[PDB]
Amino acid sequence: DIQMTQSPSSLSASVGDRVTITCRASQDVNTAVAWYQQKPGKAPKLLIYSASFLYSGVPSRFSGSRSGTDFTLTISSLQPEDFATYYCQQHYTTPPTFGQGTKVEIKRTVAAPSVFIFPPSDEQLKSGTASVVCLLNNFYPREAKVQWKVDNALXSGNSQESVTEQDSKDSTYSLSSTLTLSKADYEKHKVYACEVTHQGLSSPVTKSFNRGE
Amino acid sequence: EVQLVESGGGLVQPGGSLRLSCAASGFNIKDTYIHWVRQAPGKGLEWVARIYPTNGYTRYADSVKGRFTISADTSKNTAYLQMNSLRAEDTAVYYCSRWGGDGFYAMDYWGQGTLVTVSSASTKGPSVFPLAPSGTAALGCLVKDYFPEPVTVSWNSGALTSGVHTFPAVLQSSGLYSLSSVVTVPSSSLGTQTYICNVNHKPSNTKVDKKVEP
């Protein structure tokens, strides 16, 4: 039918930048293209309707334009409360097709990750399973290599990572790597440590603990 | 005073059936087109079906044609989406919207979005475990092994919110979700204040308040 190649996929801009999201159509769709803002966890909301008409309630910093088959969303002064993924959709021929989606984050100064190590809970060893959590609190940018060291020997493929959304205050992130093991295996070792590598660090940071010590 | 509310979703076996309702308030659905747009857990927006409640003209996406049925009722001002032969592909949050100005305003009003999980693993309540630290103090609760989404974790019954991070749920190899929710508090309050996480689970009817202290 009609595709919608929305570019880019993800971008970063500090407070006050001029953001431009490009949405190229696949054929003639006239001025029947709209834009939507969707904050994480909630429902999409209309921003621009019919190519270049601002919706009621949307601030004057949002605007759209049409140049043939290309539709651009324009944010004059990017605000901190614009952290959301944007989509472009056409309604010229059924079905309506959405864009790929452009996630917008706020660029700030590089911050160092606060590393914490968590031993498993004794209320969990009673069930025959152990889990070691490595905390990376408030850091920017998002890229961070978390590798586990057991008895100073590099382990891998036994832990899952999870990163939050951009924080509403200090526009940073938070990561938690959970090394899932078992009571039959967690006690067959001694030293547990997670190594953190980040741009805000000069050398890799390591937080360790000896089992029972 | 224009709002759309969806209801009727939840966990469902593969190939099973599920009906979704979309009650509209603030306008009559007889004047507008009603749509159903789903969003896969992490992916974009996919249009499913459309209906014109005046005469019931229905157009469906080619990925749901023959399996899904959309219907309306002007006497109830409520739209319906009958979903059959459900697969894991259909696991998504199903929104419901309208077309204002007969299409000139596009999908202006959307619903709160109810999620439909299409799996076969039974529901399971989470196991909440504490995380004792050593403000260089940080504690949290491990919400491990539960099914399905979502779960709500608050601290100190909502009174503790400054510097709280609840990580998204990652799906373990055992098909069970798990996440942690930590907090950064001043270190001079580990034997004075009381830190309790409130892990509430509605699908499994689980309500745990595991106090965290070293």
GROMACS .gro file of C-alpha atoms in nm:
model
  427
    1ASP     CA    1   0.000   0.000   0.000
    2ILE     CA    2   0.157   0.325   0.124
    3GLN     CA    3   0.470   0.306   0.338
    4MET     CA    4   0.596   0.577   0.574
    5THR     CA    5   0.975   0.599   0.615
    6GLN     CA    6   1.012   0.814   0.927
    7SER     CA    7   1.368   0.923   1.004
    8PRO     CA    8   1.564   0.926   1.220
    9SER     CA    9   1.494   0.644   1.464
   10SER     CA   10   1.646   0.811   1.772
   11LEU     CA   11   1.799   1.153   1.835
   12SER     CA   12   1.933   1.365   2.119
   13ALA     CA   13   1.904   1.741   2.163
   14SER     CA   14   1.970   1.968   2.459
   15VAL     CA   15   1.715   2.210   2.604
   16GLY     CA   16   1.644   2.482   2.348
   17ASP     CA   17   1.746   2.301   2.029
   18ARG     CA   18   1.545   2.301   1.706
   19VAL     CA   19   1.431   1.943   1.644
   20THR     CA   20   1.335   1.831   1.293
   21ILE     CA   21   1.179   1.488   1.231
   22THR     CA   22   1.143   1.388   0.865
   23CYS     CA   23   0.861   1.163   0.739
   24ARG     CA   24   0.872   1.074   0.369
   25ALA     CA   25   0.567   0.916   0.207
   26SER     CA   26   0.570   0.641  -0.055
   27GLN     CA   27   0.335   0.812  -0.304
   28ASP     CA   28   0.087   1.099  -0.335
   29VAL     CA   29  -0.101   1.141  -0.006
   30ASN     CA   30  -0.174   1.518  -0.030
   31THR     CA   31  -0.201   1.700   0.305
   32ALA     CA   32  -0.353   1.399   0.487
   33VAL     CA   33  -0.068   1.336   0.733
   34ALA     CA   34  -0.078   1.378   1.111
   35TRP     CA   35   0.175   1.362   1.394
   36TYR     CA   36   0.149   1.198   1.736
   37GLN     CA   37   0.344   1.226   2.062
   38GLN     CA   38   0.350   0.924   2.294
   39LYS     CA   39   0.518   0.949   2.632
   40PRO     CA   40   0.641   0.613   2.769
   41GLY     CA   41   0.365   0.410   2.933
   42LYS     CA   42   0.072   0.626   2.817
   43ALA     CA   43  -0.143   0.666   2.502
   44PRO     CA   44  -0.049   0.858   2.185
   45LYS     CA   45  -0.173   1.215   2.155
   46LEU     CA   46  -0.231   1.426   1.845
   47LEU     CA   47   0.007   1.715   1.774
   48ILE     CA   48  -0.042   1.826   1.411
   49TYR     CA   49  -0.344   1.735   1.199
   50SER     CA   50  -0.375   1.770   0.821
   51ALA     CA   51  -0.004   1.822   0.748
   52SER     CA   52   0.037   2.174   0.889
   53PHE     CA   53  -0.239   2.256   1.139
   54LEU     CA   54  -0.161   2.281   1.510
   55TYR     CA   55  -0.402   2.100   1.740
   56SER     CA   56  -0.585   2.268   2.027
   57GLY     CA   57  -0.375   2.271   2.343
   58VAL     CA   58  -0.041   2.186   2.181
   59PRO     CA   59   0.213   2.466   2.245
   60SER     CA   60   0.312   2.702   1.966
   61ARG     CA   61   0.661   2.547   1.961
   62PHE     CA   62   0.522   2.257   1.753
   63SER     CA   63   0.461   2.296   1.380
   64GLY     CA   64   0.449   2.086   1.065
   65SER     CA   65   0.500   2.139   0.694
   66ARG     CA   66   0.451   1.962   0.362
   67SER     CA   67   0.694   1.976   0.067
   68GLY     CA   68   0.545   1.740  -0.189
   69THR     CA   69   0.574   1.389  -0.044
   70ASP     CA   70   0.790   1.488   0.257
   71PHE     CA   71   0.636   1.588   0.591
   72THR     CA   72   0.852   1.735   0.867
   73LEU     CA   73   0.770   1.784   1.235
   74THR     CA   74   0.940   2.092   1.379
   75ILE     CA   75   0.998   2.180   1.745
   76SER     CA   76   1.127   2.536   1.782
   77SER     CA   77   1.260   2.528   2.140
   78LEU     CA   78   1.288   2.171   2.269
   79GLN     CA   79   1.162   2.147   2.628
   80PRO     CA   80   1.253   1.884   2.890
   81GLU     CA   81   0.892   1.757   2.893
   82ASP     CA   82   0.912   1.655   2.525
   83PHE     CA   83   1.080   1.321   2.606
   84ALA     CA   84   0.860   1.089   2.398
   85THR     CA   85   0.851   0.883   2.079
   86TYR     CA   86   0.695   1.059   1.780
   87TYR     CA   87   0.499   0.898   1.496
   88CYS     CA   88   0.367   1.011   1.159
   89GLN     CA   89   0.057   0.865   0.996
   90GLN     CA   90  -0.131   0.911   0.669
   91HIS     CA   91  -0.504   0.876   0.604
   92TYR     CA   92  -0.528   0.915   0.226
   93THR     CA   93  -0.585   0.547   0.139
   94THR     CA   94  -0.712   0.279   0.376
   95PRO     CA   95  -0.535   0.144   0.575
   96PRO     CA   96  -0.369   0.422   0.775
   97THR     CA   97   0.004   0.353   0.800
   98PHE     CA   98   0.226   0.483   1.080
   99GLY     CA   99   0.590   0.581   1.066
  100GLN     CA  100   0.870   0.380   1.221
  101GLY     CA  101   0.877   0.606   1.526
  102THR     CA  102   1.137   0.860   1.641
  103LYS     CA  103   1.241   0.848   2.007
  104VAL     CA  104   1.365   1.185   2.135
  105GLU     CA  105   1.593   1.209   2.439
  106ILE     CA  106   1.736   1.514   2.614
  107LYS     CA  107   2.112   1.560   2.579
  108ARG     CA  108   2.295   1.669   2.894
  109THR     CA  109   2.645   1.666   3.040
  110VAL     CA  110   2.819   1.334   3.100
  111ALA     CA  111   2.757   1.198   3.451
  112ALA     CA  112   2.930   0.915   3.638
  113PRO     CA  113   2.737   0.599   3.733
  114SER     CA  114   2.705   0.521   4.104
  115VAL     CA  115   2.779   0.147   4.123
  116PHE     CA  116   2.623  -0.076   4.389
  117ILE     CA  117   2.649  -0.453   4.439
  118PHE     CA  118   2.369  -0.657   4.597
  119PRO     CA  119   2.418  -1.005   4.748
  120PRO     CA  120   2.125  -1.248   4.726
  121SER     CA  121   1.859  -1.247   4.996
  122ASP     CA  122   1.865  -1.522   5.259
  123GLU     CA  123   1.488  -1.546   5.208
  124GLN     CA  124   1.574  -1.651   4.851
  125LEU     CA  125   1.853  -1.902   4.920
  126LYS     CA  126   1.593  -2.100   5.117
  127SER     CA  127   1.412  -2.159   4.786
  128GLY     CA  128   1.723  -2.293   4.612
  129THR     CA  129   1.798  -1.992   4.390
  130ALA     CA  130   2.025  -1.688   4.408
  131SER     CA  131   2.040  -1.358   4.220
  132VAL     CA  132   2.310  -1.089   4.233
  133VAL     CA  133   2.206  -0.740   4.122
  134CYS     CA  134   2.448  -0.471   4.001
  135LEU     CA  135   2.311  -0.116   4.024
  136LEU     CA  136   2.414   0.177   3.802
  137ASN     CA  137   2.237   0.483   3.944
  138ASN     CA  138   2.195   0.810   3.752
  139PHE     CA  139   2.437   0.819   3.458
  140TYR     CA  140   2.459   0.973   3.112
  141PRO     CA  141   2.495   0.872   2.835
  142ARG     CA  142   2.316   0.538   2.811
  143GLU     CA  143   2.594   0.309   2.686
  144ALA     CA  144   2.754   0.114   2.971
  145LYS     CA  145   2.932  -0.223   2.969
  146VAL     CA  146   2.852  -0.435   3.276
  147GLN     CA  147   3.054  -0.758   3.290
  148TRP     CA  148   3.052  -1.000   3.582
  149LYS     CA  149   3.364  -1.140   3.750
  150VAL     CA  150   3.342  -1.454   3.965
  151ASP     CA  151   3.659  -1.552   4.153
  152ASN     CA  152   3.828  -1.289   3.933
  153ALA     CA  153   3.730  -1.509   3.635
  154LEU     CA  154   3.517  -1.344   3.367
  155UNK     CA  155   3.162  -1.497   3.350
  156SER     CA  156   2.899  -1.420   3.080
  157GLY     CA  157   2.555  -1.509   2.947
  158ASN     CA  158   2.404  -1.559   3.294
  159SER     CA  159   2.267  -1.209   3.361
  160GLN     CA  160   1.997  -0.985   3.215
  161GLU     CA  161   2.012  -0.606   3.184
  162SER     CA  162   1.737  -0.346   3.210
  163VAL     CA  163   1.752   0.032   3.165
  164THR     CA  164   1.487   0.280   3.274
  165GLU     CA  165   1.354   0.571   3.071
  166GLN     CA  166   1.519   0.912   3.084
  167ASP     CA  167   1.469   1.049   3.435
  168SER     CA  168   1.221   1.334   3.476
  169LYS     CA  169   1.474   1.532   3.684
  170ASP     CA  170   1.842   1.472   3.607
  171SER     CA  171   1.788   1.351   3.249
  172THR     CA  172   1.999   1.038   3.301
  173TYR     CA  173   1.942   0.661   3.314
  174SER     CA  174   1.967   0.365   3.550
  175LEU     CA  175   2.077   0.009   3.479
  176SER     CA  176   2.041  -0.314   3.676
  177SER     CA  177   2.211  -0.642   3.582
  178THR     CA  178   2.077  -0.948   3.766
  179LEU     CA  179   2.307  -1.252   3.770
  180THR     CA  180   2.060  -1.539   3.811
  181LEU     CA  181   2.214  -1.858   3.952
  182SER     CA  182   2.111  -2.126   4.202
  183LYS     CA  183   2.192  -2.228   4.558
  184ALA     CA  184   2.376  -2.534   4.425
  185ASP     CA  185   2.596  -2.302   4.213
  186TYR     CA  186   2.605  -1.972   4.405
  187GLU     CA  187   2.782  -2.138   4.699
  188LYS     CA  188   3.035  -2.313   4.471
  189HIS     CA  189   3.222  -1.981   4.438
  190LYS     CA  190   3.361  -1.709   4.665
  191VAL     CA  191   3.404  -1.364   4.508
  192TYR     CA  192   3.125  -1.187   4.317
  193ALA     CA  193   3.192  -0.859   4.137
  194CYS     CA  194   3.051  -0.659   3.847
  195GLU     CA  195   3.275  -0.436   3.634
  196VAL     CA  196   3.134  -0.107   3.502
  197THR     CA  197   3.274   0.077   3.199
  198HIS     CA  198   3.130   0.417   3.113
  199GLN     CA  199   3.236   0.737   2.938
  200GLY     CA  200   3.204   0.928   3.265
  201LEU     CA  201   3.472   0.703   3.417
  202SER     CA  202   3.849   0.708   3.373
  203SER     CA  203   3.899   0.340   3.463
  204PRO     CA  204   3.651   0.054   3.509
  205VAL     CA  205   3.475   0.059   3.846
  206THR     CA  206   3.433  -0.269   4.036
  207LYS     CA  207   3.215  -0.341   4.340
  208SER     CA  208   3.270  -0.682   4.501
  209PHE     CA  209   3.178  -0.885   4.807
  210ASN     CA  210   3.288  -1.216   4.957
  211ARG     CA  211   3.011  -1.464   5.031
  212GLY     CA  212   2.935  -1.426   5.401
  213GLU     CA  213   3.210  -1.166   5.449
  214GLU     CA  214  -1.557   1.590   2.832
  215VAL     CA  215  -1.459   1.366   2.539
  216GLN     CA  216  -1.298   1.039   2.647
  217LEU     CA  217  -1.282   0.677   2.529
  218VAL     CA  218  -1.245   0.386   2.773
  219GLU     CA  219  -1.145   0.032   2.677
  220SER     CA  220  -1.202  -0.286   2.878
  221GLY     CA  221  -1.219  -0.662   2.839
  222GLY     CA  222  -0.853  -0.755   2.786
  223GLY     CA  223  -0.619  -0.991   2.965
  224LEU     CA  224  -0.438  -1.321   2.934
  225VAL     CA  225  -0.575  -1.569   2.679
  226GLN     CA  226  -0.465  -1.903   2.537
  227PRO     CA  227  -0.336  -1.914   2.177
  228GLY     CA  228  -0.623  -1.952   1.932
  229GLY     CA  229  -0.873  -1.848   2.198
  230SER     CA  230  -1.128  -1.569   2.184
  231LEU     CA  231  -1.151  -1.229   2.352
  232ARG     CA  232  -1.389  -0.935   2.315
  233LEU     CA  233  -1.282  -0.574   2.368
  234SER     CA  234  -1.527  -0.292   2.439
  235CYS     CA  235  -1.471   0.079   2.367
  236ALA     CA  236  -1.724   0.300   2.544
  237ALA     CA  237  -1.732   0.660   2.422
  238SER     CA  238  -1.832   0.958   2.636
  239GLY     CA  239  -1.875   1.317   2.519
  240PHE     CA  240  -2.000   1.241   2.165
  241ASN     CA  241  -2.210   0.992   1.972
  242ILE     CA  242  -2.016   0.729   1.776
  243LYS     CA  243  -2.277   0.751   1.499
  244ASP     CA  244  -2.108   1.069   1.372
  245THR     CA  245  -1.747   0.946   1.346
  246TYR     CA  246  -1.538   0.648   1.239
  247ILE     CA  247  -1.409   0.424   1.519
  248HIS     CA  248  -1.065   0.264   1.497
  249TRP     CA  249  -0.865   0.000   1.682
  250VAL     CA  250  -0.487   0.053   1.691
  251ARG     CA  251  -0.256  -0.192   1.868
  252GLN     CA  252   0.105  -0.150   1.982
  253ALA     CA  253   0.325  -0.456   2.029
  254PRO     CA  254   0.523  -0.460   2.357
  255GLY     CA  255   0.803  -0.232   2.237
  256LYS     CA  256   0.713  -0.187   1.868
  257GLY     CA  257   0.529   0.090   1.682
  258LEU     CA  258   0.160   0.144   1.609
  259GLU     CA  259  -0.034  -0.099   1.389
  260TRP     CA  260  -0.384  -0.022   1.263
  261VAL     CA  261  -0.628  -0.313   1.299
  262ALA     CA  262  -0.986  -0.229   1.201
  263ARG     CA  263  -1.229   0.054   1.128
  264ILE     CA  264  -1.607   0.087   1.148
  265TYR     CA  265  -1.871   0.345   1.059
  266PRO     CA  266  -2.143   0.287   1.322
  267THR     CA  267  -2.413   0.453   1.108
  268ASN     CA  268  -2.420   0.157   0.867
  269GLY     CA  269  -2.147  -0.071   1.004
  270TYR     CA  270  -1.899  -0.048   0.716
  271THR     CA  271  -1.595  -0.239   0.842
  272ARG     CA  272  -1.244  -0.250   0.695
  273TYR     CA  273  -0.983  -0.475   0.855
  274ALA     CA  274  -0.606  -0.501   0.835
  275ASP     CA  275  -0.485  -0.781   0.610
  276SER     CA  276  -0.313  -0.945   0.910
  277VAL     CA  277  -0.645  -0.987   1.094
  278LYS     CA  278  -0.889  -1.038   0.805
  279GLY     CA  279  -1.101  -1.346   0.868
  280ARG     CA  280  -1.007  -1.373   1.237
  281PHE     CA  281  -1.111  -1.038   1.388
  282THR     CA  282  -1.453  -0.872   1.380
  283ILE     CA  283  -1.533  -0.511   1.472
  284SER     CA  284  -1.884  -0.403   1.567
  285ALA     CA  285  -2.064  -0.104   1.717
  286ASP     CA  286  -2.390  -0.017   1.891
  287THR     CA  287  -2.528   0.336   1.863
  288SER     CA  288  -2.777   0.272   2.145
  289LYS     CA  289  -2.480   0.203   2.376
  290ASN     CA  290  -2.220   0.437   2.220
  291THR     CA  291  -1.971   0.150   2.252
  292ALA     CA  292  -1.746  -0.014   1.995
  293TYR     CA  293  -1.645  -0.379   1.998
  294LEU     CA  294  -1.354  -0.585   1.863
  295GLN     CA  295  -1.413  -0.961   1.850
  296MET     CA  296  -1.072  -1.130   1.837
  297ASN     CA  297  -1.050  -1.499   1.744
  298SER     CA  298  -0.769  -1.742   1.660
  299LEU     CA  299  -0.538  -1.533   1.876
  300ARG     CA  300  -0.163  -1.578   1.829
  301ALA     CA  301   0.142  -1.440   2.008
  302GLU     CA  302   0.166  -1.182   1.727
  303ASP     CA  303  -0.160  -1.026   1.852
  304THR     CA  304  -0.008  -0.969   2.199
  305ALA     CA  305  -0.023  -0.589   2.223
  306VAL     CA  306  -0.189  -0.293   2.392
  307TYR     CA  307  -0.512  -0.227   2.200
  308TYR     CA  308  -0.611   0.139   2.176
  309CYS     CA  309  -0.942   0.278   2.051
  310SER     CA  310  -0.972   0.612   1.871
  311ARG     CA  311  -1.206   0.812   1.648
  312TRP     CA  312  -1.169   1.021   1.332
  313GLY     CA  313  -1.269   1.379   1.401
  314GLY     CA  314  -1.412   1.591   1.123
  315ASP     CA  315  -1.493   1.276   0.922
  316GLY     CA  316  -1.117   1.232   0.877
  317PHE     CA  317  -0.992   1.593   0.874
  318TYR     CA  318  -0.867   1.579   1.235
  319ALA     CA  319  -0.734   1.220   1.215
  320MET     CA  320  -0.716   1.013   1.536
  321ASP     CA  321  -0.745   1.300   1.783
  322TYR     CA  322  -0.884   1.122   2.091
  323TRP     CA  323  -0.738   0.792   2.213
  324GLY     CA  324  -0.822   0.553   2.495
  325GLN     CA  325  -0.617   0.458   2.799
  326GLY     CA  326  -0.522   0.133   2.623
  327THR     CA  327  -0.580  -0.213   2.768
  328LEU     CA  328  -0.317  -0.479   2.698
  329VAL     CA  329  -0.393  -0.828   2.566
  330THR     CA  330  -0.138  -1.100   2.641
  331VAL     CA  331  -0.165  -1.411   2.422
  332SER     CA  332   0.042  -1.683   2.590
  333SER     CA  333   0.002  -2.029   2.744
  334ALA     CA  334   0.196  -2.005   3.071
  335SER     CA  335  -0.024  -1.987   3.379
  336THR     CA  336  -0.036  -1.678   3.599
  337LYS     CA  337   0.215  -1.671   3.884
  338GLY     CA  338   0.260  -1.437   4.179
  339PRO     CA  339   0.594  -1.262   4.227
  340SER     CA  340   0.842  -1.337   4.503
  341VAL     CA  341   0.964  -1.017   4.671
  342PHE     CA  342   1.315  -1.031   4.817
  343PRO     CA  343   1.503  -0.751   4.997
  344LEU     CA  344   1.835  -0.596   4.895
  345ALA     CA  345   2.053  -0.491   5.191
  346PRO     CA  346   2.321  -0.226   5.123
  347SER     CA  347   2.651  -0.150   5.298
  348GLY     CA  348   2.423   0.896   5.050
  349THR     CA  349   2.624   0.585   4.969
  350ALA     CA  350   2.331   0.361   5.067
  351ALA     CA  351   2.090   0.200   4.821
  352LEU     CA  352   1.825  -0.067   4.881
  353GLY     CA  353   1.559  -0.232   4.668
  354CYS     CA  354   1.313  -0.516   4.620
  355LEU     CA  355   1.359  -0.802   4.374
  356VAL     CA  356   1.024  -0.872   4.205
  357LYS     CA  357   1.119  -1.208   4.054
  358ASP     CA  358   0.922  -1.483   3.878
  359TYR     CA  359   0.575  -1.349   3.800
  360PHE     CA  360   0.327  -1.366   3.513
  361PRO     CA  361   0.198  -1.171   3.346
  362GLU     CA  362   0.247  -0.795   3.317
  363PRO     CA  363   0.196  -0.550   3.474
  364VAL     CA  364   0.313  -0.500   3.833
  365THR     CA  365   0.314  -0.189   4.052
  366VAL     CA  366   0.590  -0.121   4.306
  367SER     CA  367   0.574   0.174   4.546
  368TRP     CA  368   0.785   0.257   4.851
  369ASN     CA  369   0.657   0.346   5.199
  370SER     CA  370   0.298   0.349   5.068
  371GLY     CA  371   0.374   0.628   4.821
  372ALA     CA  372   0.533   0.860   5.078
  373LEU     CA  373   0.883   0.776   4.949
  374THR     CA  374   0.916   0.888   4.586
  375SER     CA  375   1.226   1.113   4.568
  376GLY     CA  376   1.497   0.911   4.394
  377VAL     CA  377   1.306   0.589   4.321
  378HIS     CA  378   1.382   0.375   4.015
  379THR     CA  379   1.163   0.081   3.911
  380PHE     CA  380   1.332  -0.095   3.620
  381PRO     CA  381   1.124  -0.237   3.333
  382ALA     CA  382   1.043  -0.607   3.334
  383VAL     CA  383   1.276  -0.840   3.143
  384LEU     CA  384   1.145  -1.182   3.039
  385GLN     CA  385   1.362  -1.460   3.181
  386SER     CA  386   1.442  -1.782   2.997
  387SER     CA  387   1.172  -1.955   3.205
  388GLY     CA  388   0.902  -1.733   3.052
  389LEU     CA  389   0.862  -1.543   3.381
  390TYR     CA  390   0.898  -1.167   3.416
  391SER     CA  391   1.128  -1.014   3.676
  392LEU     CA  392   1.240  -0.664   3.775
  393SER     CA  393   1.388  -0.466   4.062
  394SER     CA  394   1.292  -0.135   4.223
  395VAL     CA  395   1.568   0.047   4.409
  396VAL     CA  396   1.589   0.376   4.599
  397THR     CA  397   1.876   0.609   4.695
  398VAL     CA  398   1.831   0.736   5.051
  399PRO     CA  399   2.072   0.908   5.293
  400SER     CA  400   2.298   0.662   5.473
  401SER     CA  401   2.221   0.811   5.817
  402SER     CA  402   1.881   0.641   5.827
  403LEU     CA  403   1.935   0.265   5.796
  404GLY     CA  404   1.846   0.185   6.157
  405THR     CA  405   1.604   0.474   6.206
  406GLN     CA  406   1.350   0.485   5.923
  407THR     CA  407   1.154   0.192   5.779
  408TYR     CA  408   1.170   0.112   5.407
  409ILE     CA  409   0.884  -0.104   5.277
  410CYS     CA  410   0.817  -0.177   4.910
  411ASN     CA  411   0.458  -0.236   4.798
  412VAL     CA  412   0.458  -0.498   4.521
  413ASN     CA  413   0.095  -0.530   4.410
  414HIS     CA  414  -0.013  -0.788   4.152
  415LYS     CA  415  -0.369  -0.789   4.016
  416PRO     CA  416  -0.368  -1.081   3.767
  417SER     CA  417  -0.247  -1.324   4.036
  418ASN     CA  418  -0.410  -1.133   4.326
  419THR     CA  419  -0.076  -1.101   4.508
  420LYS     CA  420  -0.003  -0.824   4.759
  421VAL     CA  421   0.338  -0.833   4.929
  422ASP     CA  422   0.496  -0.570   5.158
  423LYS     CA  423   0.851  -0.697   5.217
  424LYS     CA  424   1.032  -0.465   5.457
  425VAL     CA  425   1.396  -0.397   5.367
  426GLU     CA  426   1.657  -0.347   5.641
  427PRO     CA  427   2.020  -0.465   5.677
   0.00000   0.00000   0.00000
